[model samples]
Target: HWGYGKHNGPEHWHKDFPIAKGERQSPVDIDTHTAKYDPSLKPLSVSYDQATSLRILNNGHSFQVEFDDSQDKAVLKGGPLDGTYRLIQFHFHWGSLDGQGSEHTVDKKKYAAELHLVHWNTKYGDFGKAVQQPDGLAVLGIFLKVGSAKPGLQKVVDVLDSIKTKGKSADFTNFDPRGLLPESLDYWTYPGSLTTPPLLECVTWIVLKEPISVSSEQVLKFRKLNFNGEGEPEELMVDNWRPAQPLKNRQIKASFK
Candidate 1:
């Protein structure tokens, strides 16, 4: 199975998923100097309701809070997106320490962590069908900085203990995702893929320029989650982020100058 261990890390991923080396892979380091200011890009509009939250689980890779995407209650629109993309789920990627962890770096400077809010285009019916199309998904990547704690994020963190091991899940409700967003909607948009396997090249990446703050102690809680499931030896879940991929011929467009 694919993992972030010494033997099976990203360098070995291309052996199983050849697309891992594809032209449009994600988590590219954003070089602000080279990014073109796109005037046509509109401000992103995100609407999230608390009632749609389903559960939080440790999926061996990372912990994610699943949402009920059956309706348009929570969605993302505008800013390079052709149509409405329904919010499906949200997750995080972190390191063992505060020095490094974020998948997408700003001018090669890494943050403490990164948050991915996954969504799928409703025109394709569901995530299954959408994952195959070129314009199938839109993932909002927000960087997490080490500072003061965010109360909105705490709600999700509090449940980490309940899902300490892989495959473990607990009921998580009434958690508003809006609290995780930064004040500014400025971002860099590009064509990319899911940071993890199957490394599908169907995502339209919208990485926010602003970062959310979370205390160093709060990040420690995430490191406590185990990658191994019941009856298996313990392995702490950390450094769950994939390193930056090639920029290739792709150009990153910024919503701000």
Candidate 2:
């Protein structure tokens, strides 16, 4: 439904989705010039389990979900975090074409796509309840770019054949998203708001600097998803990512000493 042509690109998203204007968008330029290095902003320990809830949905967006955290137990420790957080859900932001999909940009460079591993602080009870709180969420941003062949993402893409249509989902079990993360856990930390509607300014962002590579063919398969209704032929839903926003005096700190 959405393409790279005029009136359908990133600049026009706010026109159709008015609430998109208020989201705490990403892919902004990270200026270390004003960043304050904090040693305490490390990644908290997270315990992965086979019991983690996994739901694959095609909500007119790319593969998405309304995940719950009742089955898995995890924690957020070290860094500026000190509490229990559960892996709630994960989703993505992609482009309409091959070379331009990710939501967050590094120094204004766009990647093939971006994946968000969302979590909620358990202190506020559960994900449904915590998402309503100011400090109830944490999002880990992973960059995906087109490059050499990667077998890592194949498993995820392999399941696409069944859910290629919109509003459809299949049971995705025994898949550890952690394996999809880049080798280096080193990241940039900052205080920012959600990239979606009701843009709450209560998120602790941990954006990874290094990007993972996926083949161009794989990138093409991702573009086949649809935002249009499943009733009609699934239209390409590529380019679902938002454009970069102004930094607005935000500070980004790296994990490196």
Candidate 3:
């Protein structure tokens, strides 16, 4: 299995998934001083129909909140995007401890964690097709900093006990992920690939400048979740984020001054 263990982790992923070494990998350090601040960039537009949330699962890698993206129910437009990008799923990447997780960095500094709200281009027909195209996906990145317990995140944290191990599933709906975002929509935009395997360079990443809040207690609970199944010895599901990759001439565009 493609687990994030010392043996089969990100370092060894390239042996099985060659795309891990691709030019446009994700979780890059954003040197904001150099990222172009474009005044012409449009403000972001996001609308989520809470009813679109379907279920939550511990997929051995990370817990994911899946949505019924069967329609343009939860849509994100404006900013650096060309057309509407439909929300499909949202998940997090955190570390086993503080100062160790978060896929993307801000000027070489990492946060407590990171949240990814994965969306696909509606023009490409569906997510399956969109992921294969260069300009087919847009993943919104929200940084998670240590702070007070977020009332919105309580709904998700409340359910972690039910899914303590891998392959566990449960009914999860009527939740709005917008509660997971920061107050400010100010952001940086770039091109990147999936953090995990089959690392297709298809994502137009929209990374927010401000961070959302999560309590220290909640993050400790995140460690309680496991990567192994019911009988397998529990492996802590942390440090699942890929390391920062090369810039490689990729432009990071800021929507504000």
Candidate 4:
């Protein structure tokens, strides 16, 4: 498995996962002045059933909430998508410090952290099959800013302690992912790939412009997560984010002006 570290970092990923060199890779720098305003982009419609959230996992990469997507228990539509996509998981990426960590950036500035809500196209079969094709996935990105404690995120933060070790997971249900999103659905869209290994270019990236808040104190806890499980040397989980990739002549279509 590729890690976000010095030895097996993003730059070295293409050695193992060649697709890392693909043109439409994600976590690109979004230059607002250069982005095109497209009124045609529809509003992003997201619906998540509280029952869909099955558990929280520490996949050695990051902690994500798994969903029961067998029957579209949760779904995302509109917003540059031609069909519906099922919600499968949601995770975070943060740095060891306050100024960096987010994969996608705005005007060359980094955020304290970023959240990814991963979904797979229902037009395709399952998530496993979806990742093999183009346009088969969509990941909604919400940037996290430093502010007063966010009650909406407290539920997630409270459980981080239990899943500090890699490959560990705990039962986490009845949690509606909608609470983590900002009030506005306005966003920027582009074609990109997964930020991790096998870097599939199967995603329609919808990055929300309005960032939600998280206290600096709470943000510190994210660094406590360990990349290696029980016996291995302790490697802090901070900076578990991919560096921004090139825009490569791609135009970012904005949902709002």
Best by TM-score: 1
Stretches of model 1 off by over 4 angstroms after superposition: none
For candidate 4, the TM-score is 0.97
In Å, residue 122's CA in model 4 sits off its true spot by 0.4
What is candidate 3's local distance difference test score? 0.89
Error of 3 at 25 (Å): 1.0
Model 2: how large is the Cα RMSD against the reference? Answer: 3.2
Point to the candidate with the largest lDDT: 1
lDDT of 4: 0.90
Clashes of each: 0, 9, 0, 0
Q: How far in Å is the alpha carbon of 165 misplaced in model 3?
A: 1.0
Query: Residue by residue across 183-215, what tens digits does model 3's lDDT show?
Result: 999999999999988788999999999998899
- Between candidates 1 and 3, the one scoring higher on lDDT is 1
In candidate 2, the residue pairs with backbone N, CA or C atoms under 3 Å apart (3 or more residues apart, or in different chains) clash, namely: 27-104, 27-105, 40-79, 42-79, 58-167, 95-101, 95-239, 96-238, 96-239
At residue 24, candidate 3 shows an lDDT of 89
Task: Please report, as a residue range, the 10-residue window in candidate 1 with the lowest summed lDDT.
Answer: 42-51
- The segments of candidate 2 whose C-alpha lies over 4 angstroms from its true place after superposition are 1-27, 32-34, 49-51, 65-68, 72-76
lDDT of 1 at 184: 96
Candidate 2, 1-257: lDDT as tens digits? 44344676556656655644543444466665555667766555655544354678886656864355775554444555657666767788887766788877776777888888788887888766776776777888889988876686787788777788877889876667666678786777776666654446667777777888888888788777777666896568777766777775667787765
List the candidate 3 regions with Cα displacement exceeding 4 Å.
Answer: 49-51
Error of 4 at 79 (Å): 1.1
